Symmetry: C8
Subunit: 254 residues, 8 copies
């Protein structure tokens, strides 16, 4: 689902959040899921791939946002020295935080729709009599059937394909149900935020918008002012260089 905003870089309302949501789901495709298939490590691997990459995509939204240093500058300065109201600083932080949650939400949704994190984390929690022969886990210890159930996420380590296919379909169904409930709760949260909060936080929104435009203007105008103060002194140095070297370029190029 990449060609849509790729061929339409106009449907955005912020650009870096659409790129990072695209990058979050493409990084899920490129990641090679390697469940340990051991009963000690399956839970932390499967749940860690649902928890740790969203934390990293969230921090990466703060690192890539170029207003977090200016906001950290204002919060470090003492009260009275601060040129901003505390509601404008709180609104600014809330704006950065809400755009930094898109790529974590994209990761959690592709992970739950794919079903592999639940298959790795919850295959030792199965009740295997619902899936095939009952004569599988008889004759085993409690320890040995935990090792048996832990190998269900691995095709080339689990030999009974019928029990593996039935247990994989059952867990991927529950994972897709959690993925649709996650999408539905986060979109209904997005609906209440985009309907109730602009009825409540107004003119902090207008001060934060003037603050954001002032930063982009101040950065650009400082760049072209440095360039015109360079062109004054660089013209002085270049012309003074050729005062002497063209005295040599007389005999050297004529």
């Amino acid at each position: 689902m990449f060609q849509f905003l790729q061929s339409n870089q106009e449907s955005f309302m912020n650009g870096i959040c659409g790129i990072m949501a695209l990058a979050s789901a493409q990084m899920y495709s490129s990641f090679e899921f390697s469940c340990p298939c051991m009963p000690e490590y399956n839970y932390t691997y499967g749940i860690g791939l649902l928890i740790i990459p969203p934390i990293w995509f969230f921090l990466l939204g703060f690192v890539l946002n170029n207003n977090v240093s200016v906001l950290a500058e204002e919060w470090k300065r003492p009260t009275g020295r601060r040129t901003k109201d505390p509601s404008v600083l709180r609104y600014m932080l809330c704006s950065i935080t809400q755009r930094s949650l898109i790529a974590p939400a994209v990761w959690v949704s592709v992970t739950l729709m794919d079903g592999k994190s639940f298959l790795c984390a919850f295959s030792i929690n199965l009740d295997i009599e619902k899936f095939g022969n009952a004569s599988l886990v008889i004759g085993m210890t409690e320890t040995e059937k935990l090792k048996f159930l832990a190998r269900i996420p691995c095709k080339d380590l689990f030999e009974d394909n019928e029990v593996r296919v039935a247990a994989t379909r059952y867990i991927k169904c529950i994972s897709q149900a959690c993925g649709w409930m996650f999408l539905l709760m986060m979109t209904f949260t997005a609906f209440l935020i985009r309907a109730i909060r602009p009825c409540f936080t107004q003119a902090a929104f207008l001060k934060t918008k003037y603050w954001s435009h002032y930063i982009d203007i101040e950065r650009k105008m400082f760049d072209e002012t440095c360039k015109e103060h360079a062109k004054s002194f660089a013209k002085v140095c270049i012309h003074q260089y050729f005062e002497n070297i063209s005295g040599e370029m007389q005999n050297f190029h004529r």
Copy 2:
């Protein structure tokens, strides 16, 4: 069917509704249908994939529409304070709702034409003597033949390929019949709305159109006014910075 409006971004009359209908059907292709193949869970999985993603695509149409906060602002304000007639607010809500139903309708139609939601939900409702051997479901309990019929949507869990192919073709035929009746009822509803309602709701349409143009003008004009009020104060700060630092850039760059 994606290259048509992809190479022709002129045949639209709204852009976000054509993108979301494209995204709805592409998300159906990317979704990996995983029927549980258990008689307790097949119905809720198959009917839930026909009900829950249309609800989510409907809410996503409200979240992506940038006039729902302005409409929620007007409805929250008391009567007398409201600058709008109640017919203009009702017409505005009806406009957002009708464009938010395109991507749900695209989902329901691709789901019924594909046939997998009916195959998952209705395979325990089959009468299997119409499809193959009669000696399949003899010798089974009522419980055991419900488990037998529940595995029909799964190729690698159902062994009799002739009975599976015959039952799959029968249910996919009924699903395609419901998909064509759904398309035909929703297009005939679209015909009656686009023929009778502009004979009845006129000049609310013209007030809602002026309201929509006024919002896009007010947002843009506020953006460029913030930028020109930034350029005044940013020019002051940059010039005052180089008053002192060019006093240092004397010895530092000459």
Copy 3:
């Protein structure tokens, strides 16, 4: 046959009719034909896929045409109040109807050239002694040979491949003959309409052309007039906002 008008969006004389004929044939390719292979349902499935999608493509031509609401407005108004002659309204309706029949005609032609609708609908009408062994349908009941002949459209439900290939080639030949006779009658109808009718309905054609140009002008001029009446009042509101907030932006950004 899609790249031709795709790379040449100049050979048209109307754009939406070329897109919908392209979309009609691409939707035939994307549709997965699933004959029930049951003698009760084969006829209605095969003939329903030849009848019902053309009705839907015809209604979709009325829904996508933006002059059907203006025409419905004029017909609803009483005689005397109507600003148009009844011949101009009849000519207008005939213009919309003739362009709405292109995508139904494209569907019927690809369906008859493919041959699957006739194979599904007419395989129980076969005389199977023309195709293979005569010892197939002996020893069967009349009911059982109807079930035998109904499975001919299904490769994985019909076991005698020689009889299936011979019966499929016979019916696809007759379907292609009906497809060429359908194309030839509809093109000869198109020839008589585009030769005799502009000798008979003239100056209703010129009034309907002025009517169509007047609609596109009135819609566009209403859009830019709403935008310039927005820019007056939006400039008032934005300037009055910064009268007070720049009084705060004194201490807040200097």
Copy 4:
């Protein structure tokens, strides 16, 4: 052979004839040849695919040409009322007819070079002792060997692959010989027409060229004249609408 004029839309001298010749040969590729492989129907199928689609491509050249209605208008009008000489009308009809024969000629040539129409139509006319065993058609009736020879165009209905390959190569050779003689006669006819006729029909060519330019000018100038007469009356209606509604937009947007 499509990328040539596709990437060079300058080598034309008429555009619709190059597109329809491209469309004629692409429609041959998309058509799935389905010989009946029955001795009653093979001739009419094979010769019908050589005769009927050229008739349809010829009529389609008349339907797509936008001067056939203006020519039909002039021929319907009585003598004396006709503003044109009869030689200009005859030259005009000959011009449309000659461009409408390109796509029929492309169809006949790809059909004869492919060889399938001759293979279907003429396989019961074979003398099968030239191709393999002589012991094939002994022990058969005259009726049964006609059914045997009719299945030669069908790989999956004819079992002796050596006799089938030899008979297919013999008939495809004769079909390619007829295809090269057809191309050579039609190109030599094109040479005599483009060398002798502009020595004989001159200044009817110049009157027909002025007639064709006059039509394209009259259609375009009528379109922009309708648009400027629309813009007069549409400006009146829009300005009169906002006389009253801006009286409401006082309190409604200030």
Copy 5:
């Protein structure tokens, strides 16, 4: 070897000759060589595909050249009436003929480098004791070994793959030798023509160049003169039409 002048339409000195040489070799690739593999017909098929398509590509160069009608006009007119010198007419004919020989030469060269025309035409002329077993053509009649050697161009009609591969490599070697000698003689002929003839036919070259530029100027200037004489009379007719119909458009659109 198509992308070179496809991506560089500047390396030409005439455009239609580069397109037809490209089309000649692409038509060789698209042509399905079907040797009869019969000793009566192999020679005429193999040598006919080396002779007949070059004659057709040569005539097609005369048909596509738009100066052959103007040259045929001048030659038909009597001496004294002719406005041209006979050397200018002879030079003009020689110019058209030399550009019309490029696509025949491309056909002959791809046909000889591919080797199939010599393999078909000359396989009954082989001496098969140079290629495999000597015990192949003993026990055969002179008639039967001619049928045996005629099937060498056909993989699926000749069973001894070692003798077929050895005889195919021998004949394709001789065909490639004739193809390189053909290329070398035609390029050395092209060298002598482009070196000796512009030393001999000069100022007929300059009169023929002025003649060619005069034709392209006269055709274009006649086209725009017809269009400006159309715009005079079309403006008269359109304005006179709206004199009466705007008298009706008073009540009809106000």
Copy 6:
């Protein structure tokens, strides 16, 4: 993940660092990992591919940066002669160093997520009783089981596929855990640097920015000044050349 900044060369804030991070990960894909599968060399190969290419990508960032020669010029010059403050030189070096660490960090992350460097380096550290038969490493010497465990990274040198797949999944899990902890520590380091340091090193940042703009201005202005001093002397030499040679070009070209 290459098409994102490839189709969007605007989301950058420096260009060479985005290219080198892209080149670092593409060089990982192109590198063919060839573990020695010997217990003496596996550790240094696997850990060397995690250490040595980041050192090389770090040095390559210094070589490709065009300000390291100007900074080396300033540091070589004695104190008092230096036109820059030591804080501006330290800030400049820190700026080059931080951008030169992106491609090393990309290499370490793709190497740990792929898992092959840990599989090569740590397969002799395994405890193989956790993975398959216990009867594998009995009957072996301590030397021989080190050779046995060293061949685990090699599919075609290790025969027990079940033990190899289980040991590969265990080590790739630990490698992906180290890769996520590495990404999380380096992004949290990037967060603290981009939040705390612009609160501490300011106006060295502004002097280093003026220094960087001054270099790009001085290089460009020296280039165009050399070109205009060339055009003076080149015009002299060319005109003086044709003073004599046009005296020869009189008789030579007239």
Copy 7:
């Protein structure tokens, strides 16, 4: 190696020589090498493909160069009549010859690096005891082992794959060694020509450059002068044509 100058048509210093070197190596790829695998013909086929196509690419460089007719004109004219010095004519011929040797050198290099011409020409010169069994060529005549060794370039005519692979690798190694020595001698020749000769042939280079610019100017200025002398006389003829025909177009188009 085609996309480089294909996407960069700026790195050239002549265009036709880069195209012909590209065409020389692409023609090597398209050529199907067909060694006769006979001891009488292998040498002349293998060495002929190394000699004859370079001669043809050399002549093709003279045919495509548009200055060889002007140079042949000057050499044909007698001494005294010649407007050029003999050193300028010799320099001009040397310039055309050196650019015409690029495509021959590209052919020889791809042919020696591929190794097939040496494999065909030199396989009867092998000493086959270095490559496999010694019992191969015992029991054979001197004539029969020449036929045995001649079939080494043919995979499907030589049965011992180990001896064939060893002999092919040995000869392709020697061919690649000759290809690298050929590249190294021709590049060192190119170095001495581009270093010593512009120290020796100067101002013949400047006269030949003025001669080449004079030809391109004289051809273009003759083309536009013919076009403006056409536009004078074509305007006369077109206006005089419509003097009479607009007398008819009075009644014919009003």
Copy 8:
């Protein structure tokens, strides 16, 4: 790794060196490595492919550089006649030499990372008891085991796949270690040259830059001066030609 500078022809600082490094690595991919697999020739083939193509890419950098003739002109001229200082000539030669070493360094690095040159050159230096059975090279002569070890680079000449895979991985590891040490030494050499030498050779750099700009200006200004001196004399010749021929074009084109 080609699309990077292919889609970004701006990241360069010289263009021909980036193209030749791209061409060096693409020529490595296109080269078919053919180890002789003979103990006399393996070393010179494997080490020759590491030595000889870098020498050729180095000379090709001198041939393609258009300043080596101007530098050779200055060095040939006697002292006193030389218009340049000897430090400017030495700096110029060092500039050409350093850019001509990029494509040799790219070749050596891809050759060492691929590992085939070390596999060919060093497989007779192996100690084969480290890799498989010890019973391989017993029963062989010293001569015969050299022939046995020489066939390790050839898959289809070495039969023990386990010993071949183990020996190939060992040598490719050592080759990749030498490739990383080569990259690291050449990049650290590039670091010391780009840091220490612009602190030492300055104003020879500025004279060599003015020299390079003067050459590009003098070549271009000589080209346009030849063209304007052509246009003077070509206008004279063309106008004088039509003085006489338009006297003939009176009767010939009127």
